[PDB]
């Protein structure tokens, strides 16, 4: 079978491209959260790990300094997740605007994707798995930054469930870049036949890894759709933010993605 | 180092660039080593060129061919750039946004600084040089068309004067792409200060490779210059194309490049 002969070594090539890029895998990542990391969850943990247990704007608040760190984590991603994508051949061929356009509307789709790899129902790995924040903590924070926090975990615990692997992740984080209904896509034609021969590879990639997983594949399209509104609830609350957090900074980048 | 720095883009050039200047004036001047380019300077040679000898929308007219040949030129021309620039190791550090941004306002500015390579006093070269297109020809077209062409024309051979070699227009058009000054560059500082180590460089190779060039550095920033006012003349009369000339098309890659341009 040449088609499911292909998909399988375009699979394996992704996965590996996958593997390269990202400095957090969730093998790596559910090793260290079951069997230690200096635990944060009050200002006197968090100072501790900035001191030296563990580990921007000059400071101002904690709530404000926990949000730029996520802003970091995001800046830091965005890279990897430029070298991931860059890493398939199909999407390199695109002219740059394309990929440009792909990354702008699909990163933080991909970030809640993978956040859900460093998080269990308590709390998130940081700074490369030597620390571990608190959820609770996290919702300690003040309202307009608390409020971008609980929705990913909402979201984590439940995407977790599915029991998915990096094999699997590669494929899906892949599906969601190279998305043909983006706005302003120039070759729209080109990426949406690339997402479906994605698609295709995670199909059958599902089939082979997990036999016994009754709808999966349909499951892991709805999560597509389920991010695509957590982005959107979340741009919304970065919107918030920009509007009454008027003291606070915004890095460059995430500015350029939150533009209209 | 400083030395270093030009040798990898001069690496980044010739394995970027198929057609190349040293090519190209071998084949304008007379070289064995190449074969004769066919010379197209109406329909009948043009066809000639189309089906055998040298080498789409529908056919519908030379002056509106020709044109689609140029758009189809500038954008393998934006391949080639695109994997040059991103050669430079420095530059595909930068976020793919700004290395677009910077793509996006300098990639005409490069082609028409290239385009003097493969130009004369009569016409250019085509098809990877298995071809010589007119220059009478080229302004022999209906109007609207015609003048896109002579203007980049009269800077190629203007251009042409300061016999410039590949080694120098390699660091000549990096320079052009790592432009800190281009609308919407997310990170200004960067792009600046790539910009001068490349400037650095051309100014100190121009020294070894032109000991008695006088004034060739300041020259060269003047035709930086005077190319990015050969590009707002040139996205003008484009523009007006679109609009006047509501049937002819306009490939998606240069509708998006032109946009902002005024
Ligand atoms: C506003 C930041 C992100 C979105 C976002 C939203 C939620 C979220 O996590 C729940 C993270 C990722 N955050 C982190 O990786 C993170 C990193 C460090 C710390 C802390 F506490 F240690 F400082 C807390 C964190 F949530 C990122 C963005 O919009 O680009
Ligand atoms: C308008 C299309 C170009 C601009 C432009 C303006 C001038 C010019 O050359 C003088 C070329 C490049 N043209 C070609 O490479 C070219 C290619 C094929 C033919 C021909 F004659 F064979 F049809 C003629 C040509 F000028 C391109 C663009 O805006 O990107
Ligand atoms: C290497 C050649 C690159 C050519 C790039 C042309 C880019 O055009 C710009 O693409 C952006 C999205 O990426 C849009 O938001 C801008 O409105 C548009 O003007
Ligand atoms: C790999 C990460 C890429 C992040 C890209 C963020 C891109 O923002 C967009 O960059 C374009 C120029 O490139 C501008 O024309 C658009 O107005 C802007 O919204």
Same mark, same amino acid.
């Given at each position: 079978?040449?088609?499911?002969?292909?998909?399988?070594?375009?699979?394996?090539?992704?996965?590996?491209?996958?593997?390269? &890029?990202?400095?957090?895998?969730?093998?790596?990542?559910?090793?260290? !959260?079951?069997?230690?990391?200096?635990?944060?969850?009050?200002? /006197?943990?968090?100072?501790?790990?900035?001191? %030296?247990?563990?580990?921007?704007?000059?400071?101002?608040?904690?709530?404000?300094?926990?949000?730029?760190?996520?802003?970091?984590?995001?800046?830091?991603?965005?890279?990897?997740?430029?070298?991931?994508?860059?890493?398939?051949?199909?999407?390199?061929? !695109?002219?740059?605007?394309?990929?440009?356009?792909?990354?702008?509307?699909?990163?933080?789709?991909?970030?809640? $994707?993978?956040? $859900?790899?460093?998080?269990?129902?308590?709390?998130?790995?940081? $700074?490369? %798995?030597? %620390?571990?924040?608190?959820?609770?903590?996290?919702?300690?924070?003040?309202?307009?930054?608390? #409020?971008?926090?609980?929705?990913?975990?909402?979201?984590?615990?439940?995407?977790?469930?599915?029991?998915?692997? #990096?094999? #699997?992740?590669?494929?899906?984080?892949?599906?969601?870049?190279?998305? %043909?209904?983006?706005?302003?896509?120039?070759?729209?034609?080109?990426? /949406?036949? +690339?997402?479906?021969?994605?698609?295709?590879?995670?199909?059958?990639?599902?089939?082979? &890894?997990?036999?016994?997983?009754?709808?999966?594949?349909?499951?892991?399209?709805?999560?597509?759709?389920?991010?695509?509104?957590?982005?959107?609830?979340?741009?919304?609350?970065?919107?918030?933010?920009?509007?009454? /957090?008027?003291?606070?900074?915004?890095?460059?980048?995430?500015?350029? +993605?939150?533009?209209?």
């Amino acid at each position: 079978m040449p088609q499911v002969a292909d998909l399988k070594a375009f699979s394996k090539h992704i996965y590996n491209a996958y593997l390269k &890029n990202f400095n957090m895998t969730k093998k790596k990542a559910r090793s260290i !959260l079951t069997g230690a990391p200096f635990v944060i969850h009050d200002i /006197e943990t968090l100072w501790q790990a900035e001191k %030296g247990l563990v580990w921007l704007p000059p400071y101002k608040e904690i709530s404000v300094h926990v949000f730029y760190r996520c802003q970091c984590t995001t800046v830091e991603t965005v890279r990897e997740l430029t070298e991931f994508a860059k890493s398939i051949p199909s999407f390199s061929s !695109l002219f740059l605007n394309d990929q440009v356009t792909l990354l702008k509307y699909g990163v933080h789709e991909a970030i809640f $994707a993978m956040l $859900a790899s460093i998080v269990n129902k308590d709390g998130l790995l940081v $700074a490369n %798995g030597s %620390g571990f924040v608190t959820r609770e903590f996290l919702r300690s924070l003040r309202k307009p930054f608390s #409020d971008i926090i609980e929705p990913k975990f909402e979201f984590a615990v439940k995407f977790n469930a599915l029991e998915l692997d #990096d094999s #699997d992740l590669a494929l899906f984080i892949a599906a969601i870049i190279l998305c %043909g209904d983006r706005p302003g896509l120039m070759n729209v034609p080109r990426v /949406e036949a +690339i997402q479906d021969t994605i698609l295709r590879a995670l199909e059958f990639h599902l089939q082979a &890894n997990h036999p016994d997983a009754q709808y999966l594949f349909p499951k892991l399209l709805q999560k597509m759709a389920d991010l695509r509104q957590l982005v959107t609830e979340h741009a919304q609350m970065m919107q918030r933010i920009k509007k009454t /957090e008027t003291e606070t900074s915004l890095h460059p980048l995430l500015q350029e +993605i939150y533009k209209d």
